[PDB]
Chain A
Amino acid sequence: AGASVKVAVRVRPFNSREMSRDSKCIIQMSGSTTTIVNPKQPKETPKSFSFDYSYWSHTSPEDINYASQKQVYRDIGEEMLQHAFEGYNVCIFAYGQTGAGKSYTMMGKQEKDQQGIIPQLCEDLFSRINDTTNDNMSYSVEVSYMEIYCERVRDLLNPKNKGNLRVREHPLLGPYVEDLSKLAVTSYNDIQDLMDSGNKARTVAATNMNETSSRSHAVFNIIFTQKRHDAETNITTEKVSKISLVDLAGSERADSTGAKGTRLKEGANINKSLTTLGKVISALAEMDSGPNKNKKKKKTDFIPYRDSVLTWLLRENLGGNSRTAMVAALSPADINYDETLSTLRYADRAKQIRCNAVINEDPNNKLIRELKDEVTRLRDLLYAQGLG
């Protein structure tokens, strides 16, 4: 069925190094629109983009138009959990380059006053499950964590040698990975501990940009099984749902990292996978909107799932009756301009919509025009009544 996507773009208020320097902001947000200005070419114009959600987390102690963490969670996570508990699949992609702030939005700090998406998701999941454990109901939750590196799948939790797992297609259950360990969990603490254990196993390498840059996509999948004993023997599994928490490696230019050999191969494969994911997401949203409004069934079109392993494994979550939302982090310095604009260009995908320019009033010209109009109106009123 329909799988309408959402696009949210966040900003990350300055860090200690950027506070120490005299760097300036370049990103401004208003309504559903974001705008960025080239520091090296301040004379031409700003570039403007528009999304479903623009989150201005730049001023932490701000009271007006501050993108609070609970606001983001209410926007995406609560809706996706509610969709999951109805018996459907949901997915969350995390996109962004180094220094953007992806990890904060995905995980957040451990002070628990400003949490990220994932701990809130897990806590609400377990709270709901423990809430509705009546005599007839039973719930099971298990977790898997894998990575995709150069179009090869690897297991992050299993301590075996990092060999390439084989991808199969069960006729009814769709694509899957052989020998991928599936572990049951009983609280969000176990989920986060397993996340730490697997994150220690990621393939991270040093580039010309940062000493620790992700080189491989990662997927944390939560399988949620519901079993209800209606009056007889109906414990037979009513529904099984999937929560996908996917961490994308960011795109890159060979100019930024001119290293040859492994780095070029990794960059090329990452860019190919990201382009295919953009294409499949855009194709999925269009037919969506189309039907939702045209209710027609223009055959089933053809969504290119097979042009990459990443989209192939996520076929069940991306398509069908599902929900989707990609969150993008945009650093705030004037030095990372070449980063930030590119991120917006990737966020412009998934139902690229008209942005409109951000023209506003010039104070002097505004006052002159308004005063001239007022003079004209008052003069017309005087002349109409014979008082001029």
Chain B
Amino acid sequence: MRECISIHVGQAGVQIGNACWELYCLEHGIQPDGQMPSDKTIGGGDDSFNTFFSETGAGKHVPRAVFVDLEPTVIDEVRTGTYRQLFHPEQLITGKEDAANNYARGHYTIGKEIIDLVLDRIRKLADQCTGLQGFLVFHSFGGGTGSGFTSLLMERLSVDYGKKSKLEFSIYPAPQVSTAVVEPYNSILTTHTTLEHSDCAFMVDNEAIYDICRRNLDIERPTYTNLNRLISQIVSSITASLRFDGALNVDLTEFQTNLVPYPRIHFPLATYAPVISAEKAYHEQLSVAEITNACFEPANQMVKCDPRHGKYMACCLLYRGDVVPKDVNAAIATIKTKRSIQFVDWCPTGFKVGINYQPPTVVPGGDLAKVQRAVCMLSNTTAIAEAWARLDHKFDLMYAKRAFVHWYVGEGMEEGEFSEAREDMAALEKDYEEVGVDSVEGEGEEEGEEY
């Protein structure tokens, strides 16, 4: 019973959750109303996989998900939509205003009186579970709710549960495009919590996804639905290892064991290789070598950062479909001989490999082609520091003049907190610069006693 509890916070979290649960319902043969006709037609089976869905006596399947927001709008769209009968009616939406792009409003002022209900329902979901594996928290940097309330929730969860893994998928602010004037303050404030209380944070950038959609899928005018569907595919690839059989299965603990060298370096990038349109699915083989090479192309990264400017510290490749080990070994050997891809000298092995038999599914009305093979790569590297440094600069440009600060102090913060967060960020950045350095020449300086 490899069970996982999903938590969606804020507008971005709820919409990514809509995409994710559409994909999960289609993978398992579950209808929008919760019934599964496959078991009725066959007579019984394991298709009600306990990773995501809980089965009642009548044959209905209720997801193991928790949606939270301070705006009634985003979740009232779900209560009256296609999937109104799938979710439990209890959706934890405060009938009040929103955090208003304010960390303080969502952490100190209004995040209270909704936190207790959220933890009570999370407790109820965790009591139903046997062998709970971890949490998957979806939220967004730069928002009020998605930053502050996620901070509070993560703190309380780390207090209560403690040992369970807590993975985090989040939308980092982009370098150029933005949807708010006070994004840097919220991001720098919530880094201080996501550094301590999470176990592994996967960051995605909307500019990168727009570029991938433009170049690969030939979509000139994408919306958030396409980005959410791509993120859903990635999360499904991560979690497939504990839902279907495979040659090599990689659980959620092996993730953290292999990709996290030190406790403060748990910020890997994520990429998905066979992102291609139906028309271009032809004229292409889509072999293991091609997709493994495409994972390492800088253009296909989901965060606007160049891996060639840093060094790879760990890689985890999760394959789906008609894949066999020998091609994976050949592809890894080919990648190890390229000079543009540099690994830190203190990690000779480098690669973790997992294989699953279930091929990826196609969502009707989607834009990804039907393929026989796929790979999701997760790479813990040092280039991510660049993605932070830009943000730091932006923060400084506003904090020298204390712009937009009185909104934060009016909601229960003091000024010094800002400085504290900034200092923490510098320390984290410094750590990356210390771990990518090559070991000192002949690490024991030199040696050579008698004989």
Contact = CB atoms under 8 A, between A and B. Distances in A.
B247 interface: no
Nearest to A251: B414
A279 interface: yes
Contacts of B417: 253
Interface residues of B, number: 16
Interface string A308-323: 0000000000000000
Interface in A313-361: 341-342, 345-346
Given A254-B108, A345-B419, A264 B412 contact: yes
Most chain A C-beta atoms within 10 Å of own C-beta, residue among B108, B402, B409, B413: B409
Contacts of B413: 253-254, 271
A258 B112 contact: yes
B330 to A, nearest CB: 46
B123 interface: no
B415 interface: yes
A31 B413 CA distance: 32
Contacts of B414: 251-253, 271, 342
Interface string B397-413: 00000100110011111
B402 A272 contact: no
Contacts of B415: 251, 271, 274-275, 278, 345-346
A275 B108 contact: no
B287 interface: no
Interface string A252-287: 111100100000100110011011101100000000
A14 B412 CA distance: 30
B419 A275 contact: no
Nearest to A282: B402
A11 to B, nearest CB: 19
A305 to B, nearest CB: 15
Contacts of A272: 406, 409-410
A271 B410 CA distance: 7
Given A275-B405, A345-B415, A268 B410 contact: yes
A254 B109 contact: yes
Interface in A336-388: 341-342, 345-346
Contacts of B402: 275, 279
A268 B406 CA distance: 9
B442 interface: no
A342 B418 CA distance: 11
Nearest to A264: B412
Contacts of B131: none
Contacts of B409: 268, 271-272, 275
Interface in A284-314: none
A37 to B, nearest CB: 16
A255 B111 CA distance: 12
Considering residues B108, B410, B412, which has the most beta carbons from chain A within 10 angstroms of its beta carbon?
A: B412
A269 to B, nearest CB: 8
Nearest to A269: B410
Interface string B409-451: 1111111110100000000000000000000000000000000
Nearest to A271: B409
Given A268-B410, A275-B405, A275-B406, A342 B416 contact: yes
A63 B377 CA distance: 67
A268 B411 contact: yes
A267 B419 contact: no
Contacts of A271: 409-410, 413-415
Nearest to B415: A275
A278 B418 CA distance: 15
A252 B411 CA distance: 11
A252 to B, nearest CB: 7
Contacts of B109: 254, 264
B421 to A, nearest CB: 12
Nearest to B409: A271
B195 to A, nearest CB: 14
A268 B412 contact: yes
A279 to B, nearest CB: 6
Nearest to B419: A345
B412 A267 contact: yes
Interface in A24-54: none
Contacts of A255: 108
A151 to B, nearest CB: 12
A215 to B, nearest CB: 15
Given A275-B402, A275-B405, A253 B410 contact: no
A342 B413 CA distance: 12
Contacts of B112: 258
Nearest to B406: A272
Could you say which of A258, A267, A276, A346 has the most chain B C-beta atoms within 10 Å of its C-beta? A267
Contacts of A341: 416
A174 B413 CA distance: 33
Interface string B167-188: 0000000000000000000000
A255 B417 CA distance: 12
B185 to A, nearest CB: 14
Nearest to A255: B108
A255 B411 CA distance: 12
Contacts of B411: 268
Interface string A216-234: 0000000000000000000
Interface string B112-141: 100000000000000000000000000000
A341 B402 CA distance: 20
Nearest to B104: A254
Nearest to B412: A254
Contacts of B410: 268, 271-272
A7 to B, nearest CB: 16
B15 to A, nearest CB: 30
B425 to A, nearest CB: 15
A382 B92 CA distance: 84
Contacts of B416: 341-342, 345-346
13 contacts: A251-B415, A253-B108, A253-B412, A253-B414, A254-B108, A258-B112, A267-B412, A271-B409, A271-B410, A271-B415, A279-B402, A346-B415, A346-B416
The 9 closest A-B pairs by CB, nearest first: A254-B412, A345-B416, A254-B108, A271-B409, A251-B414, A268-B410, A342-B416, A275-B409, A272-B409
Given A272-B409, A275-B405, A346-B415, 5 more contacts: A272-B410, A341-B416, A342-B416, A345-B415, A345-B419
